[PDB]
Amino acid sequence: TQAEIKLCSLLLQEHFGEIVEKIGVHLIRTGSQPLRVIAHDTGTSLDQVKKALCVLVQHNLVSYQVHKRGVVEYEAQCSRVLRMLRYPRYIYTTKTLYSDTGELIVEELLLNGKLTMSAVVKKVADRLTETMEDGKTMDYAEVSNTFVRLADTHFVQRCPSVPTTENSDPGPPPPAPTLVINEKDMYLVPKLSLIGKGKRRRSSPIPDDGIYWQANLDRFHQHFRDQAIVSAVANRMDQTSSEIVRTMLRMSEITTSSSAPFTQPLSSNEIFRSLPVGYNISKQVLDQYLTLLADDPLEFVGKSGDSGGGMYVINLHKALASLATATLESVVQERFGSRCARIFRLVLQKKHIEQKQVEDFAMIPAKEAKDMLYKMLSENFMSLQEIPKTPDHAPSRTFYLYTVNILSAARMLLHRCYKSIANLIERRQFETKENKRLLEKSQRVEAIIASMQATGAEEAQLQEIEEMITAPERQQLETLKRNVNKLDASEIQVDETIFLLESYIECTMKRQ
Amino acid sequence: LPDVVLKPPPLFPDTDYKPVPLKTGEGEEYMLALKQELRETMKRMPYFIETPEERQDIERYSKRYMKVYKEEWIPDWRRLPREMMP
Amino acid sequence: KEQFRETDVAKKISHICFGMKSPEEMRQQAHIQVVSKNLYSQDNQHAPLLYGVLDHRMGTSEKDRPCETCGKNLADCLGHYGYIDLELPCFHVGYFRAVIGILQMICKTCCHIMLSQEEKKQFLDYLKRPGLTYLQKRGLKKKISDKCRKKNICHHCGAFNGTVKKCGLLKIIHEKYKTNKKVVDPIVSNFLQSFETAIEHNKEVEPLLGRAQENLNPLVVLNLFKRIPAEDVPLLLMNPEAGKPSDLILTRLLVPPLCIRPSVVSDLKSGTNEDDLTMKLTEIIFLNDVIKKHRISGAKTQMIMEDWDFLQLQCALYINSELSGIPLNMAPKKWTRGFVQRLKGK
Amino acid sequence: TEGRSRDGGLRLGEMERDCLIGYGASMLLLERLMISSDAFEVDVCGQCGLLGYSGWCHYCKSSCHVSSLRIPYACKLLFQELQSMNIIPRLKLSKYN
Amino acid sequence: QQPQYKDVPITYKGATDSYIEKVMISSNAEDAFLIKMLLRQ
Amino acid sequence: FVLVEMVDTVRIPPWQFERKLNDSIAEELNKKLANKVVYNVGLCICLFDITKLEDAYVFPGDGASHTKVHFRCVVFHPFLDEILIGKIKGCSPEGVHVSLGFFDDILIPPESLQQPAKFDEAEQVWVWEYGEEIRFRVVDESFVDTSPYTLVGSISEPGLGLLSWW
Amino acid sequence: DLMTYKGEVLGITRFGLAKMKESVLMLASFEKTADHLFDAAYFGQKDSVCGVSECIIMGIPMNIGTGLFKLLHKADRDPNPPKRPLIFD
Amino acid sequence: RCPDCGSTELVEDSHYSQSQLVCSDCGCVVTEGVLTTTFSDEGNLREVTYSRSTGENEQVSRSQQRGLRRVRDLCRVLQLPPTFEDTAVAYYQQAYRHSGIRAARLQKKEVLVGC
Amino acid sequence: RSVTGGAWYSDQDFESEFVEVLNQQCFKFLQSKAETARESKQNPMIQRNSSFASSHEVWKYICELGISKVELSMEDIETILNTLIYDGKVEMTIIAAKEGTVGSVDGHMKLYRAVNPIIPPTGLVRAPCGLCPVFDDCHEGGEISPSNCIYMTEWLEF
Ligand code: SF4
Ligand SMILES: [Zn+2]
Ligand SMILES: [Zn+2]
Ligand SMILES: [Zn+2]
């Protein structure tokens, strides 16, 4: 996981600093270790180690556990560090499904990790004060309503809270508070009757103490998987089937967990009743849609029962496998061409196949199909079974058949995407640091204008800013800006493929 | 029999295929705007702990005028183990 | 005015650290990329080819021709290494036992080791003791390897991880689908029934359907090692700063300077006496060119795998000219001096 | 060289080294087996622990940590041969004090 | 095109003086002249 | 002007054993750090004093006397706000070449911060009128050897009035 | 006492010699060069220069013999010389 | 030449088992010591020719191989020294460079070997 | 026909132009048929049934076109459509047809329809790092570095 460690190092250096990213990389590479050996291996001061650990545990990036002799062991979560790159997508989906209030709520929850309801509503009010104008003021009622609406939809979840120390062995306290979590109050909100109005940042007792919240990345991942499969079935059959599957997934969100081979049994009657009234579709047309989706060669849904009229079930693992197959064939087509993509789909459909059979079924002349096979084998996309006639396994007396292992292919593709995002971040930082002189020049020539904007604003300071030597260099600044924008967009785009690959990898894990 | 090459392959071999143009729309524009805003606003937060400057030259009268003063967040020591108190 | 730079320090060596270099560091260490399978040029005055073997940019071997990299004579030049890129990776004959050990340690699906969290923490605390010696390290490696080989079911993902053994020479095979005398498993049956096309187009698949385990070519084992978590690296008894597991499978070859490969221009005839390592590297480059030509021309997979195995055994002989499982058909004609032969001996 | 006709010198075999060790003559052994036989001066970089030339490290592309060092030429040949075998001896230098 | 001759003379490597008793010159079928000197001490 | 704690290894040859060690050490340190610039420190002037002097070892090699000496030496390094008095030892159209009196010609003030009456027409014209004061701004260091200076810094010229010289 | 100091009678053979010694250089120079060298490279076992074998190989004076102690020159000096006082500080 | 005086009268003289360059005017050496190969390594190293270290001797057709083997057996049945064989194979390789000669019948190659 | 002959193995030379033209024409015909079925909008079942096209139907359509001189048998068009399936652009379903205008398979008949891809190109293929052939040699500090990358420079200049 060298690429993962490098990406985590770059992200931590960009987001939190240098003295903390070293501790983070050490925790990721060496696993769980006590604070003493961490400070010994890192070679820095103890106070900086403590500050790094506290700022990491604040954002729920690392955790601590107790062991023999009461020693505390701190372990980092590389997956949690990788997930923080997906924050803009979380903010976008919470701004799409909700108003901008929930957007700011999730933004503050991600930028602070652990906070109380009063704190987050106060921060949202203070940030929205400058957004609106006309002297009016907002209250905490609508913010609390948006918060509880995010809570019941499981987008936000209460952080693991330390139990009552007075009732749990009142006396000598352990070195670690031993934070635990309860599923009862996981999405419950205690009543906060206090209200107020946010201040406009003029620059001129806690009822919800002990209760901290955080964005539930599991809900965001489930929602993104639902959106992906909806877009897939929309590109496949029609938008009507996409709406049907969106309604059934919305119904299944609550009654199912995040990891299950199939969803709960849903009948066509309740799906029709819960269907939005914007579509003038009858029950027979819905039954036809369901029975044609059941006959799909992709097997996204399944019957799995006949009671209750039309009983149907969806296949989460099969849908994720189909999405991974689509991603793999798309990247193969974009990397090697359409003919190599055809060869890949051929060798993927058939479990095992021979070179002459590949050329016959793919209809490609010699000296090219074998070249594509070799180019695809050199990139760890296929594997040779190599069934031997003799235990000597001599190449002259054995067969060779190509076979695509989707698991290893997805793993290597995820590694390639990680290294690609790392290289993009490195290139962005390089372009930023190589032009830091022009950046400081632009900053000073624009701060000459930023100062005395209103008080003491003479017009004689407007015809000399562009007179500097930075004027012929503005094209370089524009190129740097557009390059940074394109790099960020490419990283965010590869983030969706990373999420798809990670979901396909995790769905087949049983953790047994 | 393969012929002998008098020049090693270039450091950047050319490929006839090019990257697909990036997706456009209000979505990607909002992505860029939000990512830049986060990158900007996260550096001044107290969570972003910069390296402590050292080898301070001298103390001057205008130090209090240029002293970098920022609000310091107090971590909840009830949730944090006792081994991190400064 | 003038920056202060230290002239000379009485430096002494404290200790030697052994390890290996990644392909990137190995490329960075080298200077030029030798791609020509030839030594000298077509001109009559025995001029060595540029970007080829015996190039003077990698040191010098003659008292008259100086080094091109450093402008010094033979008595002053120290030599320079070179890197040779290979189309297909090859198993390192020296670390092949270590490769088999690591493959027995880690899983073939989730890249994790076959060790429980309790035993993981136990071995971590046992290794954290200061002053760990060579014998203690080898004993700990033996104990952990035995405890991992005792288990067969993956504690991380659950996939079956059967025994792994060396078949033939420089070939490793993982027996995932082992022969089960008791009630059979569904996974092995689903695997065996997936050969319908091979059975239809070839009857010999039916008698040879058994013992068709997973042969781990250098590509697959390299891709598996590239995804090893760094947390499990200290548990493999290998130092992380010394090297990485993916560095065990080699993709490049380090051609040594001319100082290790003396050339004697025998003016009595038209010839230059070169060491055996130069001929081995020439044969390796020739095999690389041949396999590239075969990949371009689209030959059969049998010929490709034969060339791959031949390149692997040639690299092994270049490292160690004397092995055990050398087949008699592909045995060397004359005895050569490999690195191991040049190291040991009277 | 070895042979007398090739102007070869005498060889300090294993038993001679054993006798010199038994006598405890550290400086005599150092002068015989290192200074007067295969003495050479190489350049080692204290950062990467590799061998340099003319006070320059091609690996790190720098020359600040490069320092000269006396060494038997056979030891340098051994180090080069081991590096060729992908077995890199990383030499961590230190002050003589 | 013109032949370039470099000198490779046979030298007497001896700590003490020597006297030449006889010099024999022969010619084989390969047109290679063989010259032998009998140094006497 | 500021003191710097330097710990250096000094090798005194045996033919200087008749001399006092506390004098030969100072002489060798002054000869080793004369008109030189320590990286990220500044131009060192001379040895100020010697704090600690441990035992004098003799190595089995060269045989000279090696001593690890702790000392304090003076270096020139402003605090980014110090006022200096330099003399104009030349001037270029892009910046005046003012050199500190007999100390170092490393101060190159850019002509882009005073009031808009700055122009050097290559006739040794310092500044178009409406013992020169100098305000250091930022230090800068670099290396020299890159194949088998380093302290110039910028200068500020604010509206100091300059009643004595324009 | 040498062959019976680890609590077990260890022979002068390569096995007992490897069990009692730690220096990789002498273990490789004795016998079984390739296997020991590759194992040491895999383990990354750093080898010091305490042994006489590596002292002879690396070209440094051995610890045994005259190289055990160190010599100090009796130079006329004054430890901790008088320091010039600070006026401004 | 001399580094100090500039005299170019440097003479090679055999010292006591040592080769060096010294000027006859000031007796100063400019280059001492010479590196020569040992017979212990000479018998180990294999000689390589430019006829093989350039890719040649592999573009030898079966017909050219037959022709050179015919030259060899023809010069061997006559009981000729190996120098005659070397000169004959050199002449054959030189004459085979023409396009009109390489594209011919077996009778032509045989009479060419004879000539 | 296997050892010698064939519509594409003419004179021991592969006919790539003919098979490419046939694939393009079949894809265009299937796309037009699917577009007509979509624009019909009478019923989803009838839309699907009309979007499907039989091998006999497309074979007769190609015969009406008459681009290739050699006779194209039923198995030839079947292999053409199988290659189109392997390209990922069409879908085939085997229905139970006892007897009709096809009569190829006993009690079965293959219907083919043009189908859109599952998902658009991913974000990885939109970056030079994902399509680089020397991606393995990518190092931070070295000869091949992301800082001095030529692929990234050309892609940003586009
Ligand atoms: S050279 Fe640039 S584009 Fe190519 S793999 Fe490396 S970082 Fe990616
Ligand atoms: Zn050199
Ligand atoms: Zn596993
Ligand atoms: Zn270095």
Ligand SMILES: [Zn+2]
């Ligand atoms: Zn002279």
